Amino acid sequence: ENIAPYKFKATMYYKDVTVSQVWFGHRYSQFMGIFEDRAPVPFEEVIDKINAKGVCRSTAKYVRNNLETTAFHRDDHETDMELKPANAATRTSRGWHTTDLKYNPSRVEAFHRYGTTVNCIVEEVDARSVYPYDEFVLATGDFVYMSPFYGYREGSHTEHTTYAADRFKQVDGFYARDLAPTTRNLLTTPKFTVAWDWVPKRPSVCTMTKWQEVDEMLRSEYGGSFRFSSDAISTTFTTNLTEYPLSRVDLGDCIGKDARDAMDRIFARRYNATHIKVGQPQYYQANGGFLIAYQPLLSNTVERIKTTSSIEFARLQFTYNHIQRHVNDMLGRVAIAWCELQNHELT
Amino acid sequence: ENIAPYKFKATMYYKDVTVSQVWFGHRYSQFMGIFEDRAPVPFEEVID
Amino acid sequence: KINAKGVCRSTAKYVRNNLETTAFHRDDHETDMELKPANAATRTSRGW
Amino acid sequence: VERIKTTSSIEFARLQFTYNHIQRHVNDMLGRVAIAWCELQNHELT
Amino acid sequence: FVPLEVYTRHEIKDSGLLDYTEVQRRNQLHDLRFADIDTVIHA
Amino acid sequence: FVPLEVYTRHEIKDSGLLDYTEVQRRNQLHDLRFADIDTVIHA
Numbered sequence: 001e002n003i004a005p006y007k008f009k010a011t012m013y014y015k016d017v018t019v020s021q022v023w024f025g026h027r028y029s030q031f032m033g034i035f036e037d038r039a040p041v042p043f044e045e046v047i048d049k050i051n052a053k054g055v056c057r058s059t060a061k062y063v064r065n066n067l068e069t070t071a072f073h074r075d076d077h078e079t080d081m082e083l084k085p086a087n088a089a090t091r092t093s094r095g096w097h098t099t100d101l102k103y104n105p106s107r108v109e110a111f112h113r114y115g116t117t118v119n120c121i122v123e124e125v126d127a128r129s130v131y132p133y134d135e136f137v138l139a140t141g142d143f144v145y146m147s148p149f150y151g152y153r154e155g156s157h158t159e160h161t162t163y164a165a166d167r168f169k170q171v172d173g174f175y176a177r178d179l180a181p182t183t184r185n186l187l188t189t190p191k192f193t194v195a196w197d198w199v200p201k202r203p204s205v206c207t208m209t210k211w212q213e214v215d216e217m218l219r220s221e222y223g224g225s226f227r228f229s230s231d232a233i234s235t236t237f238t239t240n241l242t243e244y245p246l247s248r249v250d251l252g253d254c255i256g257k258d259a260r261d262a263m264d265r266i267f268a269r270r271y272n273a274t275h276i277k278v279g280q281p282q283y284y285q286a287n288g289g290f291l292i293a294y295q296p297l298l299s300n301t302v303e304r305i306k307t308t309s310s311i312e313f314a315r316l317q318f319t320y321n322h323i324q325r326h327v328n329d330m331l332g333r334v335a336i337a338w339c340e341l342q343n344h345e346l347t
Numbered sequence: 348e349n350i351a352p353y354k355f356k357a358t359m360y361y362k363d364v365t366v367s368q369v370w371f372g373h374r375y376s377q378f379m380g381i382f383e384d385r386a387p388v389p390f391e392e393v394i395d
Numbered sequence: 396k397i398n399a400k401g402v403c404r405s406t407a408k409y410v411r412n413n414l415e416t417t418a419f420h421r422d423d424h425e426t427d428m429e430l431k432p433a434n435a436a437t438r439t440s441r442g443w
Numbered sequence: 444v445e446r447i448k449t450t451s452s453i454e455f456a457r458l459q460f461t462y463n464h465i466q467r468h469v470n471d472m473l474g475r476v477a478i479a480w481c482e483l484q485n486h487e488l489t
Numbered sequence: 490f491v492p493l494e495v496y497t498r499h500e501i502k503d504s505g506l507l508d509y510t511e512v513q514r515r516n517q518l519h520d521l522r523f524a525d526i527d528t529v530i531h532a
Numbered sequence: 533f534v535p536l537e538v539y540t541r542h543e544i545k546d547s548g549l550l551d552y553t554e555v556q557r558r559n560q561l562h563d564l565r566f567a568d569i570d571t572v573i574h575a
Contacts, residue, residue: 003498003539003547016566019380020412030416035380063529065367065520069377086565092558097566101413106575114370114379121566125558128549140562141509141555143517164527190526211538234458234533288492308492311536312454317490319462319533323469330473337480345487350496350504363523410572455535462533498544509550 001289001307002209006148008199010127010138013046013120014192015039015060017071020115024107032112037064038191039071041120043169046186046193051177055080056098056120064190073118074103083122083179093139095123096179122179127196131207131251131304134160144187144194149201151185159201163187170198206254207304208291213262215270219294226284228292229318235311236318237292239284244291246283250304252291255283259293267295275299288313360393362386402427 018036022029039060041050049055058079061070072078081098089095098120105113127148129136135145145162151170161168167188174184185198214230221227221241228237246252259281267277275297284292289307365383369376396402405426408417419425433442502508520526545551563569 004543005547005549016562018412019378020414021380022414022416028417029414030418031411033380034412035378037378037381063527064378065365065381066525066528066530067367067369067378068529068531069369070375071377089561089565092561092565095565099567101568101571101573104414104573116377119566123566130547130549135514137510137514137549139554139558141513141550141559143514145518145521162521166527190520232534233536235536307538309494309498309538310454310492311538312452312458313490313492315454315458315533315536319458320490323462323465327469330469334476341483351500352504352506413568413571413573415572415574450535450537451541452535452537455533459533498539498547502548508548509552509555510548513550 001305002207004209006129006133006136006205008127008148008196010125010194010196012123012125012138012140012142012192012194013041013050015041015056015071015118015120017060018102018117018119019071020102020104020117022105022113022115024105024109024111024113026110029107039064039118040188040191040193043186043188043193046195047171049080050083050122051175053080054083054177054179056083056122058118058120060118060120071116071118073099073116073120075105075116081120083120093124093126095121097121127194132160133201133205135162138194142189142191144189146187147201148196149199149204151198153183154200156198156201163189202251202253205251207251208249208255210254210258210262211290213266215266217294219296227321228284228286228294229321234318235314236321237286237288237290237314238317239286239292244283244285248303249291250302255291255293259283259295263293263295271297286314290314360388362388396427397430400427401430403430 015038016036017039018034020034021032023032039062041056042061045057049057058073058076058081059070060073061068063069083096083098086095086097099118102115102117102119104115123140125139127136127138127144129148133147133149135143136148137143146168147159147161150156150159150161150168169186171182171184171186174182176182176184183198184195186193186195212230212233214232216232217228217230219226219228224241226239226241228239230236246255249255263277263281267275278296278298281293281295284294285305286292288310289305291305362385363383364386365381367381368379370379396404405420405423405428406417407420408415410416430443436442496504539547
């Protein structure tokens with residue numbers, strides 16, 4: 001069972017409206033309050049000046065908490081700062097910020113002076129979503145209440161969003177900035193904007209993970225249940241005789257392609273000139289929730305599955321079955337030879 | 348060993364005192380600060 | 396004053412967010428309060 | 444200079460020990476059985 | 490041999506009192522659920 | 533017997549959408565990365 005969340009790059013654009021309030025006193029100056037806010041940048045800004053010219057305005061026009069507000073950085077008129085990369089850090093993805101300090105009013109004695117600050121920050125993170133891929137998270141701890149695959153083309157509108165259509169715009173033929181045409185995907189959450197290269201859901205996600213590639217997996221039907229014994233990985237699975245229809249596995253598209261590639265690679269590497277495939281690859285569902293893609297050989301002569309967290313049941317099954325085959329075979333030979341000895345000694 | 352925590356319903360009552368400070372400017376209006384506070388409701392309020 | 400006399404000033408002189416600011420507690424002139432232990436709590440390390 | 448990475452399951456090694464213990468025992472005992480069986484056959488030849 | 494777990498990874502995850510996902514997922518719904526993030530007022 | 537895990541502890545840790553370490557480690561770099569914490573301005 002795939003418990004690895006969906007992972008993909010994502011670009012977070014926001015202006016840190018961090019307004020400060022300062023008092024200048026008779027002998028020294030102290031704050032009265034500092035408000036910080038994360039302000040979204042409109043779609044048109046990301047397209048026209050983040051993607052095209054790598055600049056960003058000194059104003060952050062956004063509707064904050066049911067009111068439209070813009071913040072003139074420097075407390076001066078609007079100006080578009082050339083974006084620049086942030087200072088270095090250890091294993092953090094690339095970030096970029098226009099402003100590098102915070103504006104503060106010059107001292108005027110015994111007066112209350114308010115100080116604004118806008119740092120139009122562009123930062124790239126990696127996003128993470130989990131089934132049902134209803135909404136996804138970004139590294140900064142924030143959220144985006146919408147499926148990673150929501151959009152317009154190819155039934156993307158089916159996938160869940162939790163925003164009015166105005167907040168969610170999409171670019172076709174998007175040219176990624178040098179900071180190949182793409183299909184970029186932007187949402188203006190009440191704090192920021194997230195852009196990730198939109199991709200079709202079913203091919204780009206899966207609820208099953210390729211766990212192992214057994215080069216030799218003996219199969220033996222027994223007691224109305226298949227036994228899948230792998231001497232290489234020391235494991236013996238058990239499944240029902242009926243195959244497992246892939247249509248029942250939710251978002252199981254990856255299984256067919258990954259399986260096919262794995263059996264083809266293994267066949268080329270080891271069984272190209274010794275065996276021949278018999279029938280198209282089969283799929284069985286094992287105890288402990290292990291979908292098995294099985295490709296029988298011969299010598300030239302809708303739901304979600306749940307997987308256990310302990311192979312040790314299956315490894316015990318394999319060890320016990322191996323030892324039992326051996327001891328049963330050997331004690332059977334002993335008993336047969338003992339009968340033959342008795343009948344032979346009768347003379 | 349029970350490591351499953353104790354679970355039970357619970358009803359949370361509060362008033363989000365979210366006070367905002369706004370400036371109206373010569374040509375446009377911008378905040379000066381927004382304070383949000385979670386305020387308890389007295390027992391008698393919940394009851395009555 | 397923390398290591399030697401266990402006192403601390405009523406002013407907090409520090410550069411906050413690219414600006415130097417100090418805060419006179421009590422809104423009065425500077426005074427060094429004798430440190431005292433905080434009230435009790437359950438399996439929290441000592442505070443003052 | 445490097446850093447080693449440790450698995451999260453001793454059960455591979457505990458299976459290795461259990462299987463090796465049982466295998467030593469059964470191989471030793473079936474070897475004794477086969478040896479005694481040969482000796483029995485050669486002995487019964489008379 | 491049936492699969493056996495003293496503690497499935499779900500209850501092991503649930504053993505924690507809180508978690509980022511649930512906790513501030515709810516904490517950032519708070520604005521969406523208990524306020525409008527689209528309506529604009531001018532006067 | 534080769535070591536075998538259906539889920540290594542790394543992917544079990546990664547199964548969570550977020551985590552304090554990554555999340556607010558980044559969230560408190562935010563100031564350092566996107567601002568100066570040493571420059572002092574007086575006027």
